[PDB]
Design a protein around this ligand. Structure first.
Ligand SMILES: *[C@@H]1O[C@H](CO[C@@H]2O[C@@H](C)[C@@H](O)[C@@H](O)[C@@H]2O)[C@@H](O)[C@H](O)[C@H]1NC(C)=O
Ligand SMILES: *[C@@H]1O[C@H](CO)[C@@H](O)[C@H](O)[C@H]1NC(C)=O
Ligand SMILES: *[C@@H]1O[C@H](CO)[C@@H](O)[C@H](O)[C@H]1NC(C)=O
Lengths: 379, 383
């Protein structure tokens, strides 16, 4: 058993004599799928993964400067030129300053001032385009066996995991002791970027990532940083020097901006997808088993889940293992309407068996064997 | 002779008092007959010692993470750390059942607290209109070779202006006393805030500073109680008993990027950008030195090639031969003998020390009368 007590839990019941069942999967939402004469299953979308993500850009967040060079001109002696202006690694700025006899020139006017610095990036993040072909959803399917350990165990070694990609959207999953289940999935959009920055991971929109005010480089191999002035600015000290100043690490700014995005290659908060379960090859274990004639004992007290279902963990006298569990629900006096666990069986005498049921509204009794459990499901 | 060759330069012309407007970056040249011409600039404005409106925190660290969890129908989770102000906390609800250690199915409370302590912060000081000190430099048009455009070393004299003593008497050596009545009058008195951050300083608006997304404390100096700590510490919830803390990190670069739009004030508590200031110069005590001096009779010669300033004026730097001291004769001829001078009394205090003279040449092919009879003449095509 799985997904019990999960807040976002949908109950999808298959139609009579339906070999298949439609299901909708989102992360944090699990679906309990039951079909007549077929095992009740719990389907959850465990995790999505993006493999071999293509590199879209590379933004710089922390920059450093060096080899500060400067050229200065007297008025009408040209405009200051430097060879560093020709280098893409260097960021530069020209300005005009008041020149006269006070600052070394013989003429009064506007003198040119060029300053270049050596733009190097020490710490940088990464943006990766995720293509539709590179998705790989992992869906866990857990059969309602009834073992005492797997109620909401949340472990992966209970059910079976199927990987589904847009390249291979359909897959046959072999559930042990229950056969083969075909799963036809149709993934939709889920144009978005994965921003690996200094060991973390985020998933943001493409436009939001491209409009980031950060120096960037294309994802192809000379590391020419565009819009370098976003990290390095130029303060005019006086007519013979324009000093460089660096803004510093924009990490904290990026964390502040990414607070709104969805955190995490494994990406949780998987996308909505619509899938179909063909169960023609699924086998319900214990269809053939004889009924139990022994007297049961309540191992664990009955508990009502969030959806009005109650779950019963019982134990057995023996002398009849294995067997089908005779389960019935009386009201107010009536007989059975609905059992969540498809086939309640006793694999071992010593192993308690869990069984989930939907009792009717108002006072009712749950008979197993003969054990009668009173219950009051608030109208 | 300060203020020469500075781009944004105003000329105010004359009795015994002149009205002037002072702006950082701008400067004025004041002239009056029988009174020495001066160069007045609003140097820098200093906030005396302002009061902290708000400290903000830009970097944060977390320790002593504590967590409490309760089963459904077992009440809300409680912690003694919720009583402490140093701890930032967050409470959530998680799905609980037989799978995560509870006997009942439902929503269980989960409370998590973390010790908020902060390594590096920035302060913000409200600049009350009272605690100001305008520094106004006044430089005399002497003509010495030292002060040609000397921004290198201060040569003039500076006056202090406060809203309590807006009037000041300054003594110009060999030139008497100058009375100065400025009116600060005033930038929305409590609008600006000085933002002291890790040795640097900025001036920003009050609303822009208050709307900054950063934790804040009352500015008084230990036991800093931080409000709005969630802006630097978030909580992610691992499943069913644990809520891990995430620190946003150093917001230094965020602050630098946000302050790129504001005007950097270059020093820690002095502002090298002032703002407008309306002043009145009273010269009833100002002495024009050189009015009893003799006319120069020797022949001059040009020390430095005539230079034109950006305002159309001409600067001429000459060396004298011998009365020493004496007054340099000066006027301009196109035909027209009249010529407007910027330097009021060009005198030669010493023979060796050259003398600079500023004049306003008339439009076109003028001539100059430095000297006498063998006084040198220079051509100038003012275009
Ligand atoms: C979760 O389950 C663990 C063991 O898993 C299952 O154990 C039995 C029921 C077998 O059916 C085996 O195939 C499974 O792997 C337990 O050790 C553990 O205590 C369980 N935890 C909780 C909270 O129920
Ligand atoms: C660059 O600066 C280093 C020291 O910072 C110096 O040793 C080197 O000679 C400089 N070279 C150039 C080309 O500027
Ligand atoms: C400016 O003042 C300094 C200080 O003595 C002086 O040495 C220099 O000659 C002056 N004139 C300049 C730099 O043009």
């Amino acid at each position: 058993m799985r997904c019990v007590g999960i807040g976002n839990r949908d109950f999808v019941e298959g139609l009579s004599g339906a070999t298949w069942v439609d299901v909708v999967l989102e992360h944090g939402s699990c679906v309990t799928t039951m079909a007549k004469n077929k095992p009740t299953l719990d389907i959850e979308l465990l995790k999505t993964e993006v493999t071999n993500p293509a590199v879209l850009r590379k933004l710089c967040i922390e920059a450093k400067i060096s080899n500060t060079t400067t050229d200065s001109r007297c008025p009408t002696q040209g405009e200051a030129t430097l060879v560093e202006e020709q280098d893409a690694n260097f960021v530069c700025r020209r300005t005009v300053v008041d020149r006269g006899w006070g600052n070394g020139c013989g003429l009064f006017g506007k003198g040119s001032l060029l300053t270049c610095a050596k733009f190097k990036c020490v710490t940088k993040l990464e943006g990766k385009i995720v293509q539709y072909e590179n998705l790989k959803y992992s869906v866990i399917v857990t059969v309602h066996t009834g073992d005492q350990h797997q109620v909401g165990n949340e472990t992966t070694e209970h059910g079976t995991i199927a990987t589904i990609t847009p390249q291979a959207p359909t897959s046959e999953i072999q559930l042990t002791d229950y056969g083969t289940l075909t799963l036809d999935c149709s993934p939709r959009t889920g144009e978005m970027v994965l921003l690996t920055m200094k060991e973390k991971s985020w998933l943001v929109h493409k436009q939001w990532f491209l409009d980031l005010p950060l120096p960037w480089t294309s994802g192809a191999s000379q590391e020419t940083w565009n819009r370098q002035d976003l990290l390095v600015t130029f303060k005019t000290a006086h007519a013979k020097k324009q000093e460089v100043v660096v803004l510093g690490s924009q990490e904290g700014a990026m964390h502040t901006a990414l607070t709104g995005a969805t955190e995490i290659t494994t990406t949780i908060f998987a996308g909505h997808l619509k899938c179909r379960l063909k169960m023609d090859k699924l086998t319900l274990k214990g269809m053939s088993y004889v009924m139990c004639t022994g007297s049961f004992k309540l191992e664990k007290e009955v508990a009502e889940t969030q959806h009005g279902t109650v779950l019963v963990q019982v134990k057995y006298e023996g002398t009849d293992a294995p067997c089908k569990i005779p389960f019935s629900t009386q009201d107010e006096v009536t007989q059975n309407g609905r059992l969540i666990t498809a086939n309640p069986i006793v694999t071992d005498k010593e192993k308690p068996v869990n069984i989930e049921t939907e009792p009717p509204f108002g006072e009712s009794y749950i008979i197993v064997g003969a054990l009668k459990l009173s219950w009051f499901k608030k109208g």
